[PDB]
């Protein structure tokens, strides 16, 4: 699988069926029709002790891998039971501006998407967890196009050395909490993994305050390559899935 028009996403159905499952994400979330529901707590993000490893290029996007070791960069709160402890987080950007995001907010695109991906420590682990619905919390943060976001900087500098696919740079000690917007209000619904397998496990959790990136740090994301060493040059630009049924399924609001 990849994104290309032959082996993108509408053809991941093929080798995961899944893809055409009754909870299958992204979506996009019409405000007009959300339910806000008084009993989703806030947000319980505890990111003091968290340990990053390396940043990786895997070809489909470049992702930044935590040491998921105590309960020391965990998601509680929200519509969650239990402590979700952080494994990576996933980025998703486009060809230009005005594409990127998987998530659409009332057909609305934007620049990019974030996702720190976190595992529920009931099922011991990474593994275990993704085969089951309650397995994964994710928190999906959207970027504009705005003045530059500080905490950003240190991603799109190191992206010199993590260009085609399969390269990796240490990167130690960058702190996830220079990503996050100032308010943690959200929209949760059930979903998938948005990339192959696909796997039905995910509470997602959708903020809504974006997060604003001058775009000469978003222009960074664009010059990574899908391609490997030595392949010929495919630029690595709209790694996005496309929205999919709802199926019914309501996204409730915090907010």
Known sequence: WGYGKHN???????????????????????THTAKYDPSLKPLSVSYDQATSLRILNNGH???????????????KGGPLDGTYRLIQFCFHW??????????????????A?????????????????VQQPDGLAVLGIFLKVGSAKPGLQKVVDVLDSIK???????????????????????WTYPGSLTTPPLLECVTWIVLKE??????????????LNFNG????????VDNWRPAQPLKNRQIKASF
Not at 62 to 73: G, P
């Open 8 to 30: 993108g996403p509408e053809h991941w159905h093929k080798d995961f069926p899944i893809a055409k499952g009754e909870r299958q994400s992204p979506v996009d979330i019409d």
């Open 61 to 75: 996007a470049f992702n930044v891998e935590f040491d998921d070791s105590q309960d020391k960069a965990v998601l």
């Open 94 to 111: 486009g060809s230009l501006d005005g594409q990127g995001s998987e998530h659409t907010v009332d057909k609305k695109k934007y620049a």
């Open 113 to 129: 998407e974030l996702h720190l991906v976190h595992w529920n420590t009931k099922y011991g682990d990474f593994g275990k967890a």
């Open 164 to 186: 085609t696919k399969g390269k990796s740079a240490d990167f130690t000690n960058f702190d996830p909490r220079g990503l996050l917007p100032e308010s943690l209000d959200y």
């Open 210 to 223: 974006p997060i604003s990136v001058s775009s000469e740090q978003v222009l960074k994301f664009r010059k």
């Open 229 to 236: 060493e030595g392949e010929p040059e495919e630029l690595m």
